[model samples]
Target: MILEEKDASDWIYRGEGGANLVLAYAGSSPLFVGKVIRIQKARRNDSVLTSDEQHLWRENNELISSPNKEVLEQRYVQNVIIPLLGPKHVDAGVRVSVSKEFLECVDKKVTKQRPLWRVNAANVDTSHDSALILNDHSLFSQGSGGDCISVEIKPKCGFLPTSRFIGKENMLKTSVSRFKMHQLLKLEYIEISEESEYDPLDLFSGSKERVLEAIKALYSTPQNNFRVFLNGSLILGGSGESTGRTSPEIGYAFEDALKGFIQSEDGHRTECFLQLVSDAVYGSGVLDRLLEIQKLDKLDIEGAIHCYYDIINQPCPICKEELSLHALPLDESLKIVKEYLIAATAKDCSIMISFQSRNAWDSEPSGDYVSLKPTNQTFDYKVHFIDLSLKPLKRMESYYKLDKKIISFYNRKQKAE
Candidate 1:
């Protein structure tokens, strides 16, 4: 049976975000040997349930009034996202009931480990009674030593939206990927200290050299977009924050951390690992499926916002009239808006590539792997998309506005096209 009743000490803090705090299993229970638990980080007003959201997701009865947000999110990921991202490369994560003491104890245990800025913002909602447990993607395998080297990247939307719904004022959206445009806005907002070298277009370009360049970019300035975990421990990247405390020393330390795991010279392990990540990224074709999933926003928010207005029985504030929306029924409008939110989830999700070095002398690898010709090594790799959280339907208008703001800011910052 799946382990349901968990003791607070059974797990340790793994990572956290604005919405959830993830815990790595510390107990020896066979059921949770290499698992992580995600519990809600509740606020005064939780992001779930807006009545419209209930209606939007009414089809999933289990989530209509689920016990906790965990159930709702799991159902969203399982019922909506998995089918779109394909059943593979993701785990829906089983839900487990947690007692108040366990929840409170976990919060206290992980408090010091959390970033102070995060702690100042919110603590784990000890009042919640449930959590989700899934396989820890950081552990490459049950193989050899802790040579498991995993890299996680929050690669934003790969392609530009060129929807007819897009106004001429935002034609720049047609050519600029969302991540690149948003980078400028983040700098202006002080969300980042500088521009990110990483580009989603390069990562998803389907070319080995371009993919390599993308990984190297991510390595150069990780910010919050890229992370490295060796043997289930963080060796790089902040947890969803641009700590901005980064210096060249961190890079050198990260390079040292890659030594045994990457099997190269002192200063050379970094390149080997980067090349290895690029190899799997191109070879495994995970980004291919993710790019297609991101395209689910076929209408873009410019069009989906209108659907939201119709769903809420409000007049379209931004419509230019004589639109083709009248040709579509209410169901069609709902589907477009729903798919747009799903596409938002895909766009915000992170990909984790876990690898294990192999020393087999004479044969092909047993599992999914990329043959790294540069190092004459074969590494078994697993790529899984994580942090596939549900995007709020209530934020449909915000998405449109944010899209507009980003495009305008980028245009103004770049001195026009």
Candidate 2:
């Protein structure tokens, strides 16, 4: 049954709360309508406008200022929302309003665990100024169908403070990856040269070619939660306990978008688009202002920020080959990730490395569970890639284990001391 604007209009919004709005559709009457659940925008912006309003005032909804939001909304409309309800559902979304009572009702109904976020309800009307309903089908088609893909990144993800006696509060999260848990579960030890160091933010900086290198590193070896998609499909993801047989579909769309640009030889242009995409997905658009500031230091933001994309002021893993780099044909760039493994008898503690794949997303899960778990922890995930032709590919996973020797080099704790 094709869902048309007329059919969707029949649905009405019921309530909203937390981050979701509720609605009812495909029924005899307007049973109930809701959304994925988000805070009321007017109220939300009003709140932000209260203190930061001075900063965000002229920037609200402005394309240049709100590029991240604009891009995400565009992607949502293009990839997820459009496919589910067809083109007609965009404008006439059911009018929805959030009430305290409705929010409580939604919270109760969405208690069950779902592979992806469960719609819980559909075809919501979100026209009220306080809130509005949208067809919940926006989640129907995800890029890569949730198949986590890994883009092999070199020089590792980021850099650590080399200064000895660095303040504990100033210390950053482990330079290593949380996705390594899957490798540890597999007993694959990972190897790292303690002497080799990198600043992860460096990857996010630089010229199109340089930034391309960093993105290549990330694209080749992707993290579980880190992913990209295009036109509602998956491209790269992860593997092992973190992602398991089903890795989170992430980063494929960005790759495909890059591929499109690389073909045109607009490397810097490609970089800007990728940056916007990255800004939309990760690194919260805070860098936007920073890049703008950098532009003041140079002729253009790209010129000023380009070096950071490749190596920052410090060393880079890709440069040192701590991570692998794939030579792409002029026609296209794909990923091939390989990592060294290590192990030690000193402690049961272990480490592993895994890559995101670009082929794991599937059409909407049949709404029935073949297998389901309560906690949303990802396990044994693999990445999937669905091409423009919709071909699905499950890339291989790289595993690694580390010895205490590597640990001794980092000056980290052996065991809480």
The lDDT values for all models are 0.81, 0.28
In candidate 2, stretches whose alpha carbon ends up further than 4 angstroms from where it belongs are 1-96, 100-199, 230-410, 413-417
Cα TM-score per model: 0.91, 0.28
Please give, for residues 1-417, the per-residue lDDT of candidate 2 as tens digits. 123333444433432222333333334533333132232312231111222222212222331232233232334334432343245323223333344444433333433321222233321222322333343332332112332222222222222224232234323323443223223323323321111112245543543444445454444344332343332123443211112221123333343454532223333433443443332223222223223322222211111112222321234222333121122231121111100000000011111112121223534423211111222222222211111010101111111112222333334332446
Per-residue error for 385 in candidate 2, Å, reads 25
lDDT of 2 at 408: 36
**Candidate 1: C-alpha lDDT:** 0.81
Poorly placed runs, candidate 1 (over 4 Å): 1-6, 44-50, 58-67, 142-146, 243-246, 320-322, 359-365
**Highest TM-score, which number?**
1
Give candidate 2's whole-model lDDT. 0.28
User: Where is the poorest 10-residue window by lDDT in model 2?
Assistant: 338-347
**Per-residue lDDT tens digits of candidate 1, residues 306-351?**
8889877778888655268746787887788888888888888889
Alpha carbon deviation, residue 371, candidate 1 (Å): 2.4
Q: Report how far off residue 68 is in candidate 2 (Å).
A: 24
